[PDB]
Write a protein that binds this ligand. Structure first.
Ligand SMILES: [Mg+2]
Ligand SMILES: [Mg+2]
Ligand SMILES: [Mg+2]
Ligand SMILES: [Mg+2]
Lengths: 357, 357, 357, 357
């Protein structure tokens, strides 16, 4: 009875507030697919996807455009829609770019369901809005820029930052972390993320040195699919190993928590399967006793974390700020959900045409 | 912003459509606590609890009456309310009659949230209504009455029945099952339930004989908290061991699925923690690959199963038919959810006064 | 041949010798149900239950009043009575408030059996009385009050105290523990209890800091039903993790010891199932090599520990001192069992009427 | 020193020799992306990809077109190229359609390396060509068409066929298998494939009935990512459970063999990561003692199996016969590798234009 009536997608390369420094060089834009899901109720659901690299951007938009005929005239009902897409893609493989596209439809379908009921998503999920602690996420920035970014975050009221590390020598990782720590003081979180760059023995050596410095967690020290190698690294540490941004569906989270790969989790709202996948992931993190943070997608993640019994941190990294209104607020380093139906995503229509592919 | 404004409870002893025959004798009424949850939106949430024995009935109503002050003036938001009650009862022990009372408040709070949004609960949970296969549940009835009840179920269009067994000799269990099977034919489900009555070696001997007869599952062969003993019984069977009506919260389901106690699950909407607990239980049964049925509470369970990715059967056993309107329908042995906001529970006010304690 | 002839219960809110400070505020009374079990031998068994919160108090008394008809005219024989109650409540769920009520009947039935034989309970159980080391249990008291309470305990001759911790920052827990340690010196036990307040990674970080301070054990760092999360915390510690006050029956202790959740145990005489349940729990702690202390119920626990092969500490926390005579004595910080038949509980009849609900 | 100089892709919808019958209806074409990899040596590598559904076809071609700039001017060296692509896609997720595209480049790069050295791929891999037993793979065809297809396969000299089953009742699966068995006789292989359609208990019941009939293996009885559920099904069977066509990379095969999910494996040359991935998969199947068959891609699989120490069957299912010359031969039901450099794939250029998208 409310039916989906259309899917529209727009591929954009948007400027990043913080250019991303990598081992190769700097990237100053993010490739996104913005999604509009029309309904027979006259409301339009909005979401977006991150394509990671511009090599995948046109392919992800073309995949979504060719999935429109599977969803148009189906009832909006995201949990039912997700089961239908999981079955339709069971041969192709309901993972990678297909699962990401399905998650973008789910996150749009939940934003429209909240609009049909004139209620923020957090309340539709049965919870009250609450401010959630956030950390500001930076990149592989070198000692001077990482310290300047940490000092700007601290001046903006965040009480933790994340820096990416994995320089050619462990001394340079430690020089970054120590310089930040001098600038922000001891009563401040410094998360660190090796973005899959170490083998297991290097990750044990480097992480035991970083745990002596005092860091908040150590994120993806090794290849993201190697859950046993993450469990061997965590078995040598007191500081917690954090992972999860690369789990494609809750069935990958379940496999990593069943072997004890990590003592923290941080699903990505797109890769875990949207709101439907995150609800499932929340139930698993509750039973396995794992505090659960978010990865990217801050606008929907502030709602999802408020319904997550083990919620821990929200990652602030504003990928779509150039094309979405700043309805999400940070107040004393906590994200505060807007009082708007659905997710609170409202497009900057005059900006989007600047960045179309 | 919609707040709870009052809790009213009424303890009743209601006549059962099918008197329950036990090893002791017959019971012809069920002790229930009917719950009304007032809200500032003018809608009233309804649920009920089963007290099992009249020894617990006044105590469960008095417990709910003394919990009213913990919930009145809280926002209706069931997931938040459940976290608050779990913390408030963490010393007393958030299990047994305290958890049942919390679940009755959760099931009422979700029925009111569906009424605030003028939408059946199944759609509020994000799914479409679908008819769900049901079986008719009988008792420890002896060969003649069990066969008459199976023939009446088959004439009503059900395609499976459950009988309780655990007579003093295995031959009498087999005489029951064979007589039903003669009366209903081979293309018909016969579930059997030993209601915790066997030790592990007796359960292996009796269940291997019942598996040779051809039964659909073997339910709670031994003490319900002995998950390892259920896993030892299931390791000796091809037919699946079914359990779960006695799990108090999803954290007990998680412990039994982590050791492989059963190849089917059937949570009870009250003991698993209401709609909030069942949503969590559904995510666990999906990841552990366990088809999930319901136990009692048919009216809400038809909605919950339609949102459950591994839904298997709905148990028809109409405990509250004497005091609730028959809005749930069975059509060719499938339960069909009513098109009514929330759960579809509407009290028979002129009947309730007949059965008050 | 000695039969039970009546059950009388009285619900009271009694003043605490040490008001209990919590994260919310102070509580100055304890809700108890005092139990009298009449017999055909003319002796009357006495016990009491702790309801934890006044929300449960009337419900627990009403449950016991409605169980009287299950026990009156049964033989006093507590082990047989316990098997009968376990079977009668196998559907309702023999846990939470039902199991607590059964344990209060068992503890009264053993006090009457000791009176029928004119012998202290410890001798009826086959052991000699012995003084058992006790620690004085305090609350979440802040640095000044926790230090004053530790100095009063040390002046009363106790050689250890327990303080509740789990302040918003780990530095405040450490400020409490260090201030106590300055006041009482190094040759003195300081147990610490987080009363389920931490997730697993916070519990590992905080407990490794507390183990560097030197504490005697770390009690219930995380949710009490999460035995695997307690085992992950204990795997990161040399100091022992203590738990068990929330195990409802020896079957829950068995599940936590089978996974290595803790290196100390401390059953509560009511939640473990009274004297019958504690005897079983003692045999499990002996085989799993776990030193076994008590939680609350000091009067019966001094007898039970003297029969427990792995007895470790008695927790002094005098909940019912306002309504029971001080027949239990502490002599140089050890509890000393009175030479009185049964448990030695004798009501202060002129005080009880002051505190009735 | 031989460098890649260009990538050209063509998306086609090609007619199938055997239309594929499914639970929904018949599909008479396959969506393929044909790949040409130009080199500085003047030879052109050829491969193709299967997109499974036409929903993915344009997206897979656009992804490959946008990956051309990552590979042009790199040395042809497929193992090095694969490591480079795994690192470049480590954030996006080197799985699903990205991994399939990488595998199509690897299979083209090995066909060109064999052409640069004027040697069939099997000899470049260090092995001699040998004929490999093949079975003819059919679909969900109903009793009459499945029996006609089995009789045509047997007349073509194949000594085994595979049929897809998972009809609404187990009796219809058994009616299919029995009808084939009557037509082909007892000295003939009948593999059966449930294409992920059963939950675990249904798969145990149906597969124990099929094992009594006598079938050669039971393939993907349940969801393909549920390796533990495949291990629970295999633990109840003597006949071997076969899986692997949906493993994306050898790292997914390793996870399923480490838990004992299956006693046979059948990687797909595209999803396992091309020739580079299959070489790795072969080493794992050898150490875990698992006979290894192929899935689709018959032309390259006849070469790969001849280098695989545990080679078992080649699956004949001729997806690209309409656009590639029939250089692969079946002689008495064995595939025989052509004596042509590289894989032996030579395009039918006059046919390809008929089927372009
Ligand atoms: Mg990261
Ligand atoms: Mg049952
Ligand atoms: Mg404690
Ligand atoms: Mg297959």
């Amino acid at each position: 009875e409310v039916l989906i009536t259309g899917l529209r997608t727009r591929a954009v390369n948007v400027p990043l507030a913080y250019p991303v420094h990598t081992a190769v060089g700097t990237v100053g834009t993010a490739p996104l697919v913005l999604i509009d899901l029309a309904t027979s109720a006259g409301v339009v659901g909005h979401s977006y996807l991150f394509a990671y690299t511009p090599v995948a951007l046109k392919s992800l938009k073309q995949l979504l455009d060719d999935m429109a005929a599977m969803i148009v005239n189906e009832p909006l009902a995201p949990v039912s829609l997700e089961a239908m897409l999981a079955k339709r893609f069971c041969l192709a493989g309901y993972t990678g770019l297909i699962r990401m596209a399905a998650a973008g439809i789910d996150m749009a379908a939940w934003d429209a369901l909240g609009k049909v009921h004139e209620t923020p998503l957090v309340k539709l999920l049965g919870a009250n809005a609450r401010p959630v602690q956030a950390y500001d996420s930076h990149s592989l920035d070198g000692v001077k820029l990482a310290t300047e970014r940490a000092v700007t975050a601290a001046e903006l009221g965040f009480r933790a930052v994340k820096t990416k590390i994995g320089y050619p020598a462990l001394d340079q990782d430690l020089a970054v972390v120590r310089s930040i720590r001098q600038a922000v003081g001891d009563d401040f979180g410094i998360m660190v993320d090796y973005n899959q760059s170490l083998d297991v023995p290097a990750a044990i050596k480097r992480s035991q040195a970083l745990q002596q410095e005092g860091v908040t967690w150590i994120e993806e020290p090794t290849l993201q699919h190697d859950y046993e190698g993450h469990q061997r690294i965590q078995s040598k540490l007191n500081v917690p190993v954090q992972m999860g941004e690369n789990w494609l569906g809750p069935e990958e989270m379940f496999k990593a928590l069943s072997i004890g790969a990590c003592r923290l989790a941080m699903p990505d709202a797109m890769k875990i399967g949207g709101v439907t996948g995150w609800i499932r992931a929340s139930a698993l993190a509750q039973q396995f006793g794992i505090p659960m943070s978010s990865h990217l997608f801050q606008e929907i993640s502030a709602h999802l974390l408020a319904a997550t019994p083990t919620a821990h941190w929200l990652e602030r990294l504003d990928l779509a700020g150039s094309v979405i209104e700043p309805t999400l607020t940070f107040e004393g380093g906590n994200a505060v959900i807007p009082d708007l139906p659905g997710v609170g995503i409202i497009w900057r229509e005059k900006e989007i045409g600047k960045y179309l592919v």
